[PDB]
Scaffold this active site. Sequence first.
Site, PDB file in Angstrom:
ATOM      1  CG  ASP A 169      -1.859   1.178   1.274  1.00  0.00           C
ATOM      2  OD1 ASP A 169      -2.007   1.943   0.282  1.00  0.00           O
ATOM      3  OD2 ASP A 169      -2.465   1.353   2.353  1.00  0.00           O
TER       4      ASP A 169
ATOM      5  CG  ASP B 141      -3.443   4.707  -2.567  1.00  0.00           C
ATOM      6  OD1 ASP B 141      -2.791   3.726  -2.094  1.00  0.00           O
ATOM      7  OD2 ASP B 141      -4.561   5.076  -2.093  1.00  0.00           O
TER       8      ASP B 141
HETATM    9  N1  LIG Z   1      -4.235   3.644   0.414  1.00  0.00           N
HETATM   10  C1  LIG Z   1      -5.151   3.403   1.326  1.00  0.00           C
HETATM   11  N2  LIG Z   1      -4.921   2.550   2.310  1.00  0.00           N
HETATM   12  C2  LIG Z   1      -5.871   2.148   3.358  1.00  0.00           C
HETATM   13  C3  LIG Z   1      -5.620   0.692   3.752  1.00  0.00           C
HETATM   14  C4  LIG Z   1      -5.858  -0.222   2.562  1.00  0.00           C
HETATM   15  C5  LIG Z   1      -7.299  -0.135   2.041  1.00  0.00           C
HETATM   16  N3  LIG Z   1      -7.397  -0.869   0.799  1.00  0.00           N
HETATM   17  C6  LIG Z   1      -8.010  -2.089   0.679  1.00  0.00           C
HETATM   18  O1  LIG Z   1      -8.463  -2.743   1.606  1.00  0.00           O
HETATM   19  C7  LIG Z   1      -8.130  -2.576  -0.716  1.00  0.00           C
HETATM   20  C8  LIG Z   1      -9.193  -3.394  -1.059  1.00  0.00           C
HETATM   21  C9  LIG Z   1      -9.327  -3.840  -2.364  1.00  0.00           C
HETATM   22  C10 LIG Z   1      -8.396  -3.472  -3.312  1.00  0.00           C
HETATM   23  C11 LIG Z   1      -7.333  -2.658  -2.952  1.00  0.00           C
HETATM   24 CL1  LIG Z   1      -6.164  -2.194  -4.141  1.00  0.00          CL
HETATM   25  C12 LIG Z   1      -7.198  -2.205  -1.664  1.00  0.00           C
HETATM   26  C13 LIG Z   1      -7.716   1.295   1.767  1.00  0.00           C
HETATM   27  C14 LIG Z   1      -7.313   2.239   2.900  1.00  0.00           C
HETATM   28  C15 LIG Z   1      -7.627   3.689   2.585  1.00  0.00           C
HETATM   29  S1  LIG Z   1      -6.663   4.233   1.145  1.00  0.00           S
END
Ligand SMILES: NC1=N[C@@H]2CC[C@H](NC(=O)c3cccc(Cl)c3)C[C@@H]2CS1
Length: 390
Positions: free
Chosen positions: A37, A233
């Site tokens: 992430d 991101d």
């Molecule tokens: N960059 C961000 N990180 C936090 C933690 C990961 C989450 N992402 C997920 O669950 C997720 C779920 C499905 C697909 C993908 Cl690519 C990610 C978002 C939040 C808010 S934005």
Amino acid sequence: RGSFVEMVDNLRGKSGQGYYVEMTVGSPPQTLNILVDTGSSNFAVGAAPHPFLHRYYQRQLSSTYRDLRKGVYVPYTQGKWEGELGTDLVSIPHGPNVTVRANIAAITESDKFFINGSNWEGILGLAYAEIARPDDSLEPFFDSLVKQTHVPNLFSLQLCGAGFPLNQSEVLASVGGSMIIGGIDHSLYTGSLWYTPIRREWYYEVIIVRVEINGQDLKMDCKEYNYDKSIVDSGTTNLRLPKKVFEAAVKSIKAASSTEKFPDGFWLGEQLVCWQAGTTPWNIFPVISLYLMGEVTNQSFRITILPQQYLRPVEDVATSQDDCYKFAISQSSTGTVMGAVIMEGFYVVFDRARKRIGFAVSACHVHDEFRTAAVEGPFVTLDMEDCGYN
Ligand SMILES: NC1=N[C@@H]2CC[C@H](NC(=O)c3cccc(Cl)c3)C[C@@H]2CS1
């Protein structure tokens, strides 16, 4: 000609569920799958049973576990978690050959965060300390890694979208891409790498200076493209655009693709659209070009994506033989987000040491006989720093 064979193909997953890398925490090593992430800065892992977790971090079983005696609460727009801060020894088996002591948020409660069948049990926030929770004194994983080892201060990401849906056996069995820690693998891209400055080290923030849809200029004041920031991101699925840009872009994409008409729910990113097997009319949808500020004064370059990137393959409801997709561009009130579906077009180099982000056409990007994704330059562009929002 850097080759990093221990790292090539170390990812799995898909844009819809996230890309993850295998990691170990504790002594003896506890194996977990961790979401990669770039849009956050906490290393956080499931640490208690949950119906969607197949495994979790057991602090009591780790002889090297250190308790920081501090909680953390992390709410997102959708979903949230709470955890207990600590440190432990951490490695990445298909990564550099090192073990580092790192901060770990041991997640003990959560709500709408873990996803049934995602296959990952935690998140690896690769962005900077300024956006770490509870505050910027909690050193992020990558910062510990570089501090404690000789790993160069750079990573690169090749997220591989299949171009078709993957059932859970296939998604477990398929190679989803590469995270190269400390280097650039030349086999993961074609053409040249072009670099955009990291505007400020919090998120991976960049500046977009022009947008085109099939070569036609969206023609908005460039500040709109970066209102209130633009970031790269990997932990977001879609290309997200500020409301005004999103509207302008959707208007333009509808007009270019107008030989065919789709439900409002398609453009809202909510419903799938299906075509007969093999007949997806890629050619009616436009290419999208984002120009990014370059490293040279008054110079920019552009990245170009296909509908094969911004139409996300999804399995049919009727589970038929149709080829089905969701529109993977949506509106944002927190600025532009270049999410997993854009990153799938490119090899992206997060060059922290030189405070810049590189883009090259991905060796694994989906395309057709007639068009491919592109990274091209230079273009003479003036007043680019004025595109940044304050
Ligand atoms: N960059 C961000 N990180 C936090 C933690 C990961 C989450 N992402 C997920 O669950 C997720 C779920 C499905 C697909 C993908 Cl690519 C990610 C978002 C939040 C808010 S934005």
